[PDB]
Design a binder for this molecule. Structure first.
Ligand SMILES: CCCCCCCCCCCC[N+](C)(C)[O-]
Ligand SMILES: CCCCCCCCCCCC[N+](C)(C)[O-]
Length: 421
């Protein structure tokens, strides 16, 4: 959904994150659950990373003539994890975790007609979480948590074929016969395909809490309600356009030129809040199944507006996403004291309504198809590894004067090691 990242755990990548939040064992998925802590005897530490290899493609042709084919844009993705849940007494316990539930790819050559809206896009996001939980009565446990999110981000864009058309158009209207437009055309042609049209980049922290509730029918059965707050990140970074300050103030699309000089610019990224009901059931000694349904009020992510020292708009862009559900169902098979198995189906609607899709964040309802294993070493430590396959229906896009077409597809590799004390 949009650009949030579930990943966070190999142990869970195996079950297409289906009910993460009611299936505590191996720790890790304590974060995103909080109220799971209460379910731990010995400090359990698990870590690892989930490798993401996405194949997203853009296809099309531009008024210009040049092709909009962008064969590959979403670079691989690292995204590590690391958790540490630790009991305190028999009513309390605390936990920590280093995850990254937000961020994206998107390359696009520094050339490419349509670069006007393709340049580059990066958002790395490390969410530091420290949670604690009470266990009220024998079957109810409540969790609360503070989160410290950090994020680096870069946004580059360049004048695509634009220069052409502009120039072109000029040259076919009673203005191509004008000593004026003529040179104007010239200048227009001068904007090299690869001229950095927009640059914004910045590092900044942001905070926000989170809570969760855990109810267990009995030891083998559970259900949960979780909530992660929004996280307004008030960036204070840099901006700059290599276009000549002339283009500015003509109320045209083209983002505020700075004559290739850096202006200090502010902007706010709203990482969305999210709710999630979940359930776990150990039907039979070896077999257990898990539900899951999540809400990510993406509605909060309305725009990427970037302002200046003097409070003017430097670079804006409508996003107007809308709420989205994500459903998941997976099961686990505990063969014997050493091995453990899992498999999952997961689906979720794209937060971005067609009216606003963008080659920048080509998003489309994603379908998950995963399964993995867990080789226990000795009642104390183990290793988690699972693969995931997400394929989605290629959808149409309409940005600027360009008509695109984008196809999504991607694989996942997970590996985790976890020890106990
Ligand atoms: C802290 C690690 C950050 C790794 C950056 C992760 C990039 C994942 C790529 C997501 C881009 C895909 N798409 C279609 C959703 O925009
Ligand atoms: C001053 C740096 C500002 C960049 C931080 C904003 C990153 C937004 C990344 C996700 C949305 C990207 N997009 C399509 C709106 O350009």
């Amino acid at each position: 959904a949009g650009f949030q990242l579930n990943e966070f755990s190999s142990s869970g990548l195996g079950r297409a994150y289906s009910g993460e939040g009611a299936i505590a064992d191996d720790a890790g998925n304590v974060s995103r659950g909080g109220g799971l802590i209460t379910m731990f005897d010995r400090p359990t530490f698990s870590a690892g990373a989930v490798y993401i290899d996405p194949d997203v493609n853009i296809s099309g042709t531009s008024p210009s003539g040049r092709s909009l084919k962008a064969d590959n844009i979403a670079p691989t993705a690292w995204v590590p994890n690391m958790h540490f849940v630790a009991p305190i007494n028999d009513q309390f316990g605390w936990g920590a975790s280093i995850t990254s539930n937000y961020g994206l790819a998107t390359e696009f050559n520094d050339t490419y007609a349509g670069g006007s809206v393709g340049g580059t896009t990066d958002l790395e996001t490390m969410n530091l979480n420290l949670s604690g939980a009470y266990r009220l009565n024998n079957a109810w446990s409540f969790g609360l948590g503070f989160n410290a999110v950090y994020a680096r981000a870069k946004i580059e864009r360049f004048a695509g074929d634009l220069g052409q058309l502009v120039a072109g158009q000029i040259m076919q209207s009673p203005a191509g016969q004008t000593q004026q437009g003529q040179a104007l055309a010239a200048t227009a042609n001068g904007i090299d395909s690869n001229t950095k049209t927009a640059h914004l980049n910045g590092n900044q922290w942001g905070f926000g809490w989170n809570a969760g509730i855990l109810y267990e029918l009995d030891k083998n059965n559970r259900y949960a309600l979780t909530y992660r707050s929004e996280v307004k990140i008030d960036f204070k970074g840099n901006y700059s356009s290599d276009l000549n300050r002339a283009f500015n103030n003509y109320g045209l699309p083209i983002p505020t030129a700075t004559g290739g000089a850096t202006q200090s610019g502010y902007l706010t990224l709203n990482l969305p809040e999210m709710w999630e009901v979940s359930g776990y059931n150990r039907v039979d000694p070896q077999w257990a199944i898990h539900y899951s349904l999540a809400y990510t009020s993406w509605s909060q992510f309305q725009q990427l507006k970037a302002t200046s020292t003097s409070g003017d708009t430097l670079f804006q862009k409508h996003e107007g996403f809308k709420d989205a559900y994500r459903i998941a169902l997976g099961t686990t098979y505990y063969y014997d004291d050493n091995w453990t198995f899992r498999t999952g189906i997961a689906f979720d609607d794209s937060p971005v309504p067609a009216q606003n899709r963008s080659i920048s964040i080509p998003d489309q309802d994603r379908f998950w198809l995963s399964a993995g294993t867990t080789y226990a070493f000795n009642k104390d430590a183990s290793v988690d590894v699972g693969v995931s396959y997400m394929h989605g229906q290629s959808v149409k896009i309409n940005e600027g004067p360009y008509q695109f077409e984008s196809e999504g597809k991607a694989w996942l590799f997970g590996t985790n090691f976890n020890y106990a004390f």
